[PDB]
């Protein structure tokens, strides 16, 4: 499935990813953590080619997607992405947000897409809000709606690039719950987050990144209770 193979990335003189490999298989919930500038979101964004590795290759489902010889629009159909800052479409209603891509990319039946959206809206508890615009929505409502929207294209993996960090604290539980629920239903998830509770409670695998590298990785409890690396412990002491 996912295979980020020894990729590097620069932004000008800025070296962000200094050789990173990440494999994730169907069903895993993989959570990536680390200090600011560690390379986390850049790694997560190489997966669906939202960034193009300065070097290295990324395969999804066994086929190389950064050789320029592949339809990336058919790739992002499989690899979902939830954004830190919600990226909802302002001019569209809740349902309209959700139903848009399926109708125009999959060519779905408008009545069918309505029930998909209404299912999903209901799933993430935004049913009463279907015809509201992405404005009368609280930040927590926003992210749940964004999540419904991504789901409506039924990806095989969901990328979460810090879905909670631009949320007032009273708003973080509800979004994290939706995320837990998805993991519990077996969704394949790669998640970049500051919320170590989530890593503990639903993480299958935890990757600690520092200075453009994976310095250590293991299970939630290995990483949170028995961390071997010094840089791993140092980071954890500051946060926990």
């Amino acid at each position: 499935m996912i295979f980020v193979n020894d990729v590097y990335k620069n932004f000008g003189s800025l070296e962000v990813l200094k050789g990173v490999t990440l494999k994730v298989n169907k069903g895993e919930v993989v959570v990536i953590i680390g200090p600011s500038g560690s390379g986390k979101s850049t790694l997560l964004r190489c997966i669906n080619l939202l960034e193009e590795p300065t070097k290295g290759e990324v395969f999804i489902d066994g086929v190389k997607i950064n050789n320029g010889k592949v339809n990336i629009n058919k790739v992002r159909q499989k690899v979902g992405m939830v954004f830190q800052h919600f990226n909802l479409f302002p001019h569209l209603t809740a349902i309209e947000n959700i139903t848009l891509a399926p109708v125009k990319v999959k060519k779905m039946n408008k009545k069918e897409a309505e029930e998909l959206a209404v299912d999903l809206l209901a799933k993430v508890g935004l049913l009463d809000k279907k015809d509201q615009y992405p404005i009368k929505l609280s930040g927590g409502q926003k992210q749940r709606l964004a999540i419904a929207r991504a789901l409506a294209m039924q990806p095989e993996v969901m990328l979460f690039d810090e879905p909670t960090s631009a949320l007032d604290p009273e708003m973080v539980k509800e979004v994290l719950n939706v995320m837990k629920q998805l993991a519990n239903e077996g969704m394949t998830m790669v998640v970049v987050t500051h919320e170590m509770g989530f890593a503990r409670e639903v993480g299958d695998r935890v990757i600690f990144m520092d200075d453009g590298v994976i310095v250590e990785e293991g299970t939630p409890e290995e990483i949170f209770y028995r961390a071997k690396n010094e840089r791993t412990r140092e980071f954890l002491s500051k946060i926990l």
């Binding site: 939202l50 159909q77 979902g80 992405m81 479409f89 891509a101 125009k104 990319v105 999959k106």
Partner: protein, 214 residues
């Protein structure tokens, strides 16, 4: 002599004629400048490297060059080719042209203005550059552009007073016409300036009021 505005009252039909001339000149020059500008924009967005380079150079040239010289170049410069274009068409062409470049930059700027996030959301849901543009980005860049356009028209009005120098019967020309029979320059200008002013305020009122709606 000394100031007399009350004497200026009889010449109203001239001013009104001048104004209506300035309006009719600008409304048309903008209208063309817009359609021209949308076209120039699309050229700079074209994948074809040649076309983007021309639209880039065209835009870079007009903006970096005086409207007056563009006026004279068309009018005077085109004579020696057996061309005698009316002052009216010269000014329209000159304006629609100067207009076109700034309109082409407003468009581009209103697109780059919509949050790069909107695009990422769209591409990452499988939508292609085409679709992303049509259903997501453009509808939002429009709300960026209309304000800068209406504001351009407002600028084109002040602009258009220059075609007076080519002998067009615009609002600015009426001062020459008037003084020829009154020997007064001052009073007819203050009136004309005041007229340009009120035109500016009014449109600016409607421009910002139409803006607060979006």
């Amino acid at each position: 002599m000394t100031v007399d505005f009350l004497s200026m009252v009889k010449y109203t039909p001239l001013f009104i004629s001048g104004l209506i001339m300035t309006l009719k000149l600008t409304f048309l020059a903008v209208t063309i400048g817009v359609l021209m500008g949308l076209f120039i924009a699309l050229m700079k967005m074209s994948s074809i490297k040649p076309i983007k380079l021309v639209a880039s150079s065209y835009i870079e040239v007009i903006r970096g060059t005086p409207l007056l010289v563009q006026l004279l170049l068309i009018y005077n410069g085109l004579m020696q080719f057996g061309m005698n274009i009316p002052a009216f068409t010269a000014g329209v062409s000159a304006l629609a042209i100067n207009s076109s470049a700034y309109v082409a930059e407003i468009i581009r700027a209103g697109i780059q203005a919509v949050d790069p996030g909107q695009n990422e959301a769209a591409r990452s849901l499988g939508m292609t550059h085409a679709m992303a543009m049509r259903y997501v980005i453009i509808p939002q860049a429009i709300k960026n552009i209309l304000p800068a356009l209406g504001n351009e028209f407002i600028v084109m009005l002040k602009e258009s007073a220059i075609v007076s120098v080519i002998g067009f019967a615009d609002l600015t020309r009426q001062a020459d016409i008037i003084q020829s029979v009154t020997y007064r320059y001052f009073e007819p200008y203050i009136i004309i300036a005041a007229i340009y002013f009120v035109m500016t305020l009014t449109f600016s009122k409607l421009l910002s009021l139409f803006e607060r709606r979006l």
